[PDB]
Amino acid sequence: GDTLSTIKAQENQIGNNLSPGDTYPKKGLSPLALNTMDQFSSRLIPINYDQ
């Protein structure tokens, strides 16, 4: 019930175009990694020992 983080996408995770019925990354590509927490994509997303 604990929200670990809320992260607004940074430059690495922004999709330029997304048409109706499309998907970013497009169908046939791999998912994108959301692995940073701060504004400049320089800090990773941590968790506790109990988490």
Partner: protein, 51 residues
């Protein structure tokens, strides 16, 4: 003698006419009720990470 009777960003005509944002409640359409948000925060839980 006042273009904005209620003191909010919208003139008496914009309020009375409804020519402002469409998400403003209809009571704020008359020039004596201010179009005005009351925003507050509430905490749901607090999580501690021992360093």
């Amino acid at each position: 003698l006042e273009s904005n009777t209620a003191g909010d960003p919208y003139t008496d005509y914009e309020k009375a006419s409804g020519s402002f944002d469409k998400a403003i409640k209809t009571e704020a359409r008359d020039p004596l009720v201010a179009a005005y948000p009351i925003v507050g925060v509430g905490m749901e839980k607090l999580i501690i990470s021992t360093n």
